[model samples]
Target: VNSFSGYLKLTDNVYIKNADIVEEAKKVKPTVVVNAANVYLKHGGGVAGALNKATNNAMQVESDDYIATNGPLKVGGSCVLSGHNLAKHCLHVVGPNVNKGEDIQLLKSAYENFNQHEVLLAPLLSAGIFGADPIHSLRVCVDTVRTNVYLAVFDKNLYDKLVSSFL
Candidate 1:
């Protein structure tokens, strides 16, 4: 298991950190845990998969049911899954998929669609198994949400980049 240690505040409210995503979820105790997901509400990779496991696959069940009735979502679309293990709700946003030829603007739209809230925990989009460069992807997330965004930074280099730039 990864240690839930250390963090850096990049802006007045936004934070970047090196920690276990699940532990970070618990630490912040956010109102919403944002899943960087695909159009079909698939929780098969990256933070989406991890969060599914952490919640005992409950989110997956909800996601599957929602997609079955609602059909595939658009690139920037989203859905909510309630009754999570660590958070009150989960916000599943259809992010850009470089592997599937989706554009970066899709991710920007997804971020823009987020309801303004007091607290939000999100992963860096396309920076994990989705295969985008962390620096560029992190910029997308940060640029979209100027404040009240807690980005889970699993990679030390990514954390370092965010910290160095803010200094």
Candidate 2:
């Protein structure tokens, strides 16, 4: 939320008031919007499901192709999909599935393997179904992502709270 000094902004975060992730992602126009999920790339639930629907199921086809050619990806492993209706690219990764402890290294590995895009929009990985605390997930995300990262919250109240806390 701090003012940018140059093209290389040290750290930047943005909040958008929208219930739909795909719509919000398009509005942000990030180089890539990450889809946090398992190596299977099921796209059957959560953000991945929505993204699959929004992108007219192209996301699934791309994911299927990747899995078919390369075999099942491991945790922190990632692949990109183009022709998305939202962001220019979609980076899929299998995040930590449990909630007992923080496994931010998976997120860090995923981000590190991403295309050299400076601006990225990512959801709170390890949260939601994964049941990690949003604040804790955000901390890990901010600490690991070395770029302009936008974390979207579908609920207005949550968005406002985060903006007040971070901005």
Candidate 3:
């Protein structure tokens, strides 16, 4: 089997890396980088913030324009933007907000919108900032992930869990 740098190759097209999402995306240069975004498409904090910073704020401008034209996305919604840094395209996904009474079903819906091909670099959506239980959330994410996908995990404990669980 082939191996990706700093990643544990789960299958030919699936890989998992114990690293910050932005950094790994920079290295892998996947076709699309998945952003854990708010419904408003504001690239302010968490993965969105780091991605905005990495792309030199251009992503924020594009996201703002997209929001202005299409309006805010709902939980389990998504949109794609290109012409940023590091990766060719950015797939912004709005996952469920638990504090707002949303749940894993919506999160799973968010997962369903992903293209999965063209090599998407992503994280465990809704598991951070929005307050998803990392353990159960991982199950949902892993269950839906199939091909041309890379999972970047920032938390050491979760990364270890992903490796132990899959490898």
Candidate 4:
């Protein structure tokens, strides 16, 4: 594997449709796993400066040693924010489409320091200027990537509707 990019196997060139990646996860048995996931992202000044560094013209952040996902979830940025079982540090990309060159780079930056089973929570709408339905967006993303997803729906009506139709 290249140190720069992760390995991706292209078996078929189908414009893959939707999938609940989490559905498949339930079928697999747990095995001894080696964790290399990075949950905390450290900015120069700390968590307070995280937002500043991730901006277009802002200073870039760096990765530190990774920790296991055993419950102590504190991403070291400005202050140690409570982030239990997150995949990695909070990644804020400016755009929703990772297919774009710039957006892909942004994603690469985020995942370069990422870890396993961490919830990559991204707002796939056109930014929060309007509103961000991450549940919907994440569902679509998992499908697009041909990965299973587990969605936690708090709204009973919405969840039922989604299960009946969307699922």
Candidate 5:
């Protein structure tokens, strides 16, 4: 996978890339791969769907088991699980929704929490199905994230916007 600009360095620790986040997660095998999931951790679509399938549906079972015990994960909240043959673990989070009392702090919290692990691969969160704006999410991502992060992007549209980030 080609990087955002040859593995464009946003900073010493941060990076951008036009690639599948799940693949990067597996390749890097970081402490955790951030999977954008619902509050109940259902492995439906988007990031969660891909990772769950990649993990051979183990992530779904694990996530289901977590919710079965802990109940719904709150917006900006997450539950961690083993990544199976993927990253060391999967940190599934409930991304904030505009209609669900979305706040900058809430979105920021996702990145901050996703950063709990020193090494991780993450995509642009909260801006697609959940209705958060791409620029908004991008701002929160760069403003406070502290992980040894790789911003793996999928869609060409999103990738184009990220290309403008540094310039």
Candidate 6:
């Protein structure tokens, strides 16, 4: 599974109760954001399972008086995103099942066509043959997309907001 831990600076205290993109900057201050928490499924794994796991993890992850939490939203069946809103918007991606030929083309399009601002955040997760390991999956996805680090997840409202972000 893709996991990350960090501290929250006092200045880095912002809650995204609603849908306020600008609040992201204000909430995250001097804090380390953890993004890309998902698992890939199909072939060996698929986006559906990966996202389900990540979202479950995020929902379960608890916080003490020390710090709060945010993110872990499923951008697509194959992508999961998490992290602090104010500090850093981390997004995760669950690659398509390796066996699926369409995966290569779809991934390529996302990498080649998507822009940085467009892909504000991206977290690569292992699915099926991959499992749930971003660091590892990222390597493979990089080769698939053919880009070191292009654009990734834009926000918690991925698929829903994706089309809007481009427009």
The whole-model lDDT of each prediction reads 0.74, 0.66, 0.78, 0.27, 0.76, 0.30
Ten-residue segment with the worst summed lDDT in candidate 4?
Answer: 29-38
Cα lDDT tens digits, model 4, 59-135, are 22222322232322222111122222222232322222322222332332322222232323222222122123434
Question: What's the C-alpha lDDT at position 64 in model 5?
Answer: 79
Q: Higher TM-score: candidate 2 or 4?
A: 2
Best by TM-score: 3
C-alpha lDDT of residue 88 in model 6 = 38
Across residues 10-58, which tens digit of lDDT does each residue of candidate 3 receive?
6765677778988877776777789999888888888889889998998
lDDT of 2 by residue, 36-106 (tens): 76778888878888878888888888888877888887776777777377778887867776664546566
| Least well predicted 10-residue stretch by lDDT in candidate 2 | 1-10
Error of 3 at 141 (Å): 2.0
Which is superior by lDDT, 3 or 6? 3
- Candidate 3's displacement at residue 143, Å, is 1.9
The TM-score measured for candidate 1 stands at: 0.86
RMSD after CA superposition, every candidate: 3.8, 4.7, 2.4, 13.6, 3.1, 15.3
Q: How many backbone clashes does candidate 3 have?
A: 0
With a 3 Å backbone cut-off (N, CA, C), the pairs that clash in candidate 1 are none
Name the candidate that leads on lDDT: 3
- Ranked by lDDT, top first: 3, 5, 1, 2, 6, 4
Residues 1-167 of candidate 1 have per-residue lDDT tens digits of 12223556676656777766777787656778888788887788688888888888888888889888999888877777773876888878777787878787677787775646556778877667776677776667667775477778777777777667653
* Candidate 1: count of backbone clashes, pairs at least 3 residues apart or interchain: 0
Tens digit per residue, CA lDDT, model 5, 1-167: 42223466777677877888777776777666788877878887777788888988888888778878889988888878887887777777777877566664688877778667776778777866777887778777888787677777787777778778554
Instruction: Give the TM-score comparing model 2 with the true structure, all chains together.
Output: 0.76
Candidate with better lDDT, 3 vs 4: 3
